[PDB]
Enzyme design. Sequence first.
Site: not given
Ligand SMILES: Cc1cc2nc3c(=O)[nH]c(=O)nc-3n(C[C@H](O)[C@H](O)[C@H](O)COP(=O)(O)OP(=O)(O)OC[C@H]3O[C@@H](n4cnc5c(N)ncnc54)[C@H](O)[C@@H]3O)c2cc1C
Ligand SMILES: Nc1nc2c(c(=O)[nH]1)N[C@H]1C(S)=C(S)[C@@H](COP(=O)(O)O)O[C@H]1N2
Ligand code: MOS
Ligand code: FES
Lengths: 50, 99, 1288, 50
Positions: C46, C232, C234, C311, C324, C1155, C1222
């Site tokens: 996020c 690396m 994590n 990602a 990776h 809105q 809404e």
């Molecule tokens: C939100 C999110 C979205 C993602 N989206 C995608 C995506 O769209 N596409 C995709 O392909 N991937 C995706 N990933 C996966 C991501 O690419 C991998 O988790 C990342 O590349 C791992 O690298 P790291 O350094 O974090 O590994 P780490 O978590 O640090 O390590 C993972 C493993 O690798 C080992 N390791 C690391 N370096 C070495 C080394 N030099 N020698 C031996 N072992 C090693 C560790 O021991 C461990 O077991 C996503 C992950 C997240 C959290």
């Molecule tokens: N940013 C934001 N907008 C939103 C909401 C919210 O939670 N966050 N809720 C919606 C819902 S479900 C309702 S019922 C209405 C309520 O507020 P209002 O009556 O002042 O529009 O806001 C809408 N817009």
């Molecule tokens: O009336 Mo908005 O909380 S569905």
């Molecule tokens: S809280 Fe969702 S990205 Fe760290």
Amino acid sequence: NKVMCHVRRVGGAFGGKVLKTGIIAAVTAFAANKHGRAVRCVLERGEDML
Amino acid sequence: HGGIEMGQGVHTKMIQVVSRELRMPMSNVHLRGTSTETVPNANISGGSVVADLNGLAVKDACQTLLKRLEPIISKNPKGTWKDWAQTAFDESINLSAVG
Amino acid sequence: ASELLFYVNGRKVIEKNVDPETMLLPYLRKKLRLTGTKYGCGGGGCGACTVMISRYNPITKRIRHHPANACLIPICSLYGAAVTTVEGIGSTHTRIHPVQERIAKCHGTQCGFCTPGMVMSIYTLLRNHPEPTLDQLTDALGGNLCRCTGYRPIIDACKTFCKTPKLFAEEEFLPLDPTQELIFPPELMIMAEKQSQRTRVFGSERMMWFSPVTLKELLEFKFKYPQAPVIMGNTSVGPEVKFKGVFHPVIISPDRIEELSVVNHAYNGLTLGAGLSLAQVKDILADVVQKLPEEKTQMYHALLKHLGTLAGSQIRNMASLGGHIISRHPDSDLNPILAVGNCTLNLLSKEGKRQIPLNEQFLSKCPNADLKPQEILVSVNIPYSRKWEFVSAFRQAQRQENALAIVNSGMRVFFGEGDGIIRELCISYGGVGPATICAKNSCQKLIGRHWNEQMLDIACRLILNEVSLLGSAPGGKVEFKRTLIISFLFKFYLEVSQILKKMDPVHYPSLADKYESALEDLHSHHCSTLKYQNPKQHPEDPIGHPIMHLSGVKHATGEAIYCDDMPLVDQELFLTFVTSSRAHAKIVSIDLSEALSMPGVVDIMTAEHLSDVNSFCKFLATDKVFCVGQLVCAVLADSEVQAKRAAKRVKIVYQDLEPLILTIEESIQSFKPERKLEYGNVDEAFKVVDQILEGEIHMGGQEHFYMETQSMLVVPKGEDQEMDVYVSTQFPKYIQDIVASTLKLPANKVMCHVRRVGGAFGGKVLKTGIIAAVTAFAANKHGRAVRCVLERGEDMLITGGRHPYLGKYKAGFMNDGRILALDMEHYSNAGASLSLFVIEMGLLKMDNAYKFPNLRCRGWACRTNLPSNTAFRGFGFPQAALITESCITEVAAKCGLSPEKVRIINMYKEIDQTPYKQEINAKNLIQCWRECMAMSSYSLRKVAVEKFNAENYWKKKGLAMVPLKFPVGLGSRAAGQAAALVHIYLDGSVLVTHGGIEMGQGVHTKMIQVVSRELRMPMSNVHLRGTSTETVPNANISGGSVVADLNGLAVKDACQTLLKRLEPIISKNPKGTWKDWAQTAFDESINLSAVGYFRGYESDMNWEKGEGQPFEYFVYGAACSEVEIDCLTGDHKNIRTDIVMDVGCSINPAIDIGQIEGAFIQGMGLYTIEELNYSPQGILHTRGPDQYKIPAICDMPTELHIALLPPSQNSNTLYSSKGLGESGVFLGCSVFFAIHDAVSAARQERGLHGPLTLNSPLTPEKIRMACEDKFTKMIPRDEPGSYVPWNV
Amino acid sequence: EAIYCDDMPLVDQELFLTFVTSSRAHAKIVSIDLSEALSMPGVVDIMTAE
Ligand SMILES: Cc1cc2nc3c(=O)[nH]c(=O)nc-3n(C[C@H](O)[C@H](O)[C@H](O)COP(=O)(O)OP(=O)(O)OC[C@H]3O[C@@H](n4cnc5c(N)ncnc54)[C@H](O)[C@@H]3O)c2cc1C
Ligand SMILES: Nc1nc2c(c(=O)[nH]1)N[C@H]1C(S)=C(S)[C@@H](COP(=O)(O)O)O[C@H]1N2
Ligand code: MOS
Ligand code: FES
Ligand SMILES: Nc1nc2c(c(=O)[nH]1)N[C@H]1C(S)=C(S)[C@@H](COP(=O)(O)O)O[C@H]1N2
Ligand code: MOS
Ligand code: FES
């Protein structure tokens, strides 16, 4: 509208918890605001009487 | 209300006022404290008159509230305050009053 | 032994004896009290926890700044580095940073919870590229999600940094001074300038953490602790210890070892260090691609392609290349490409150097091809492509970026000088089993053959049985995955049979003219315009002006306090829940003995420990569970960590019960109350129609996905059993009731306080109150403040979502498309508990824009063994109106008329009557439709789309337009009542409060606008703190689109009362300040406090007779949307959307346009990408491609126009304004029907007539399988009852 | 169980304020030295009228 004062109870006052209280609160609030911290001020009996 | 409890029992007296004016037991009324957020521009708690004056203001809010409810009270004289409050809400009658 | 030393916002931080398990996000918030950085989801998805990380490279003399998600950073990694949070770049008590100023003043914050993350992504990018392009900025925000704004205003804020009647003054924004930025702390330069070889050690009772700082040492540690992970980024290890129960006593986490970050430009290729981030690899390869000729850069193009989508920016900058490769995720986007490209790994042990190939066996973790336990990956060699060698990579996910692949691929061919005999072939796939797999046997059988369609048909056959999936394969979607496998094969055929044509024109054939669009894909720019109105009104009157949200800057600076941002109250405990893991089962027993003995545990409550206060008007399961996620136990501990540890050791034994009801159809086998509307006489009408048509549409649910998870703090005062409840809720009065009831206390003992909510959309009411009740019971029992904050996974499971719907209809219609008869059935899925209100609003709002002269309408709520669903933004309308639009587009199909012809002739006339006999003036409905047809240039674009579809076989466009009547009103007058309290202090300043809750909709901003007008004072003179049952009692729920309407009327009422009292004083001194008027009022004993009250809009509905006046007014609108689909992958792109909207007189057009966009995108997601996957046992799937995806920036339509219809007076409402909020959700289905149109154009050209019912959500799976072709016919299929599916 | 002002729990990171008071009845303040006081453990700030 930015400053609100809240009082649940006072452990006796008899008139002696007004002007001087406010001065200490003002000084205390200045410090609080300056450092972004809650600040507590409680007087010992000797200082209080003085 | 704007009065401060320093041990003189002002809050006890206000609940006695509320209890008489709304015709309910003191156990049904509660007070938390004093705050510029709830009651603005209040005078100092001094001059031997804290209870006198805040008592008159508490009585004033209570009477206002009782006037609004008198239609509901006459139509169901043996009902609880829970019933009166609920039907007041159901009939869009305001249950908050400044005194 | 060692001490952890790093910087946060310029200040030194030292931790002695630090716990290695400490993550940065809780450390920042709890130990440093920097609460600007938020928890959104804890998996890196996020971007709410986005921060900047800075480091000084001592050899290159350069400071490198990269973004990162703090949730996944262990603080022991930060040694010698400098963190910067949102608070670090500026504040209201120093100077505000321009990024903070502009995101706020461009109205880029609503609830504000995502704002610090957005700010730190934009900040970090501007620190690297002071004069950026918009591409770079929107790439930086690929990792950042927002549920309120629709992203458009955040995009506008970004544009003001690019050297390329408005809602904000761009010319007044102060310029980004690149020289007055934050100095990298000098001490860290001095530490770096002296390369310590000493390897750092951090310990606790559970874990040892070694940070080797030389290569020698790293290999030394890898020998001693062979099974310890080398951390690396994590981003692989982190997420699996969080929610896959994995634990490592020893961690090795090396600092920057130079040999691990090598970039060699060899003669044969390049060797890349294993410790380079994926972001740095993207940069290295971008440069290499431009510096080398385009047949040695073949591998490097395919890697760049998949790294662009991989990602978002934060994870790419954290994740390493070695991580990776070693992770070996089955859905990995880079491994299938590396697999095909003759890549080799440079291994290094204490014993020696060693080199292995990166092949299938390696990706399968066969120990013969794997690393041996005592060695580490130093670098990977990716060789240059030879001439006549070609490489291609494809992928399909749920949306275009920041989403894991359902299937992906790497494919290579080698021809070797001239003639088109294939000499080598590698075809690797991901998402098709537990690891990345290469079709080597198929590839052997194809060597020797030419490149043409003879070989495709056989290649497809012989891969489809080699790389097969069982019908019960994890991930689900088996027939879609089957199709993608051969569809990517087709795309590769095309692609590489074109570089051949390019290079050797005479010897190879040209592509068929209707085929070329299959090659280029769909990749956006983000444009928008906004029309609205703006002489006779005073310049000091703020009503109608686009005033910024009052917290807007506080959102941007992280100074806005949300419930969990409140400081730790002395000795507070944490509460966490054990939830049901079965959908319908007997609870045979609960063992708490291990859990109760564990560190920090104070109490564990089951339903027995709540006795006669385990229900209201039940909280904890007694002896049966009726869905997964139902509450079972409550674990109370000294800390959150200890609470969750102990909770996972509670042993519950179950016994499953029959029947396990999951669908709406299963739920139809006692007594349901019916709801019904009847207009005219539908039985007679069916006799005189030209045709009759039956059909049905299923519609999926929707998670609220408010960015702030469920959060509360319950604090006992210690006198008279007084509780204060601080909770993120929409209904304080209900919190007060359920807590008081639970404690057997009067309501005057319990007060509920709410400053702000980080989004709610209806999902912060019933379930919130249950958790508060349980929490308050614990607090009271132990005389302690108790805090309960839910993690995203638990939150989605415990809270419900929108009701899934089933619509069945019988429509009698004329050949001109007019619908004289309409029989209609609605079915909501209620979950475990009842939902009937949602059916009622469904039926009342079902008609939408159309006059059905004879209509029977009936609904039923259906209990199932799933989490209990709740009300949502729309309240049955987005479901009910979709049923009727589906019914229209089907009738349109049977008449050979566009749906838009059928809509326009079934619409209400200017004056007309609803099915429940309420009169309406639908003039503005007509205008909204007229203007949207004009604004959008519908007619011209219609032929453009027909023209396109005649020239393109594998890519289609579609266009649709839907109208909106959204009625507004509650069941009763009493439900619409509202109250306020206004004080004037003796300095003339004003404090106002009311029963409404700020959830990001700007209700508090609007009330100050009201106060400013009514008392004739600037908004700077008025202040509001929050909402409280202590100040305004008995307030209704903040919902129903009317919070501002109603509380605005009550605020106005208090103000007028106050002004009446003062008019004697004002007339006697007309040029006096409010300070003077207030003072003389006090001196004359005039009261300056007033309650304000509005009784509510008159409203009623007799459901027996089916007639009433339920609605006070109707919001009108229309919307046009255009899309392009990929018929080979089921992907799509939203090209353009046009929205016109009747808002009456907007009280604040910035807020009201905010809105509309927000609701639209929320509806867009409901109907396209938002999808909840449940198992046949009722377990929610939450992992891999089953991850739930809300709309990101990449889903926002390329073009976006929004018009506010000119006003026309509503004496009944507050300043003639209409409560929207809404309304705009249903307008999201313009995208649905645009895609529906595109699919039909592919089905007409290919000749598949008859029944086309596409269900919501219209996912890429559903798109693809609807576009039938030879590939859909070709795939192998399974018998229905032969296997147990992963889903449905 | 009655809470008076100092009975309120410690709020996160609160500071304490105490006053230096005059020891003379009618005198000129020639100087104030804060250098030793300012260097001592825990001291955050010392405010004079300036
Ligand atoms: C939100 C999110 C979205 C993602 N989206 C995608 C995506 O769209 N596409 C995709 O392909 N991937 C995706 N990933 C996966 C991501 O690419 C991998 O988790 C990342 O590349 C791992 O690298 P790291 O350094 O974090 O590994 P780490 O978590 O640090 O390590 C993972 C493993 O690798 C080992 N390791 C690391 N370096 C070495 C080394 N030099 N020698 C031996 N072992 C090693 C560790 O021991 C461990 O077991 C996503 C992950 C997240 C959290
Ligand atoms: N940013 C934001 N907008 C939103 C909401 C919210 O939670 N966050 N809720 C919606 C819902 S479900 C309702 S019922 C209405 C309520 O507020 P209002 O009556 O002042 O529009 O806001 C809408 N817009
Ligand atoms: O009336 Mo908005 O909380 S569905
Ligand atoms: S809280 Fe969702 S990205 Fe760290
Ligand atoms: N226990 C107690 N009694 C007290 C005081 C007090 O501080 N404690 N103050 C006195 C003073 S100085 C005044 S002015 C009055 C004010 O309260 P009343 O007006 O309600 O009597 O209380 C008197 N009695
Ligand atoms: O009026 Mo009492 O505080 S002397
Ligand atoms: S403002 Fe971005 S999530 Fe609510």
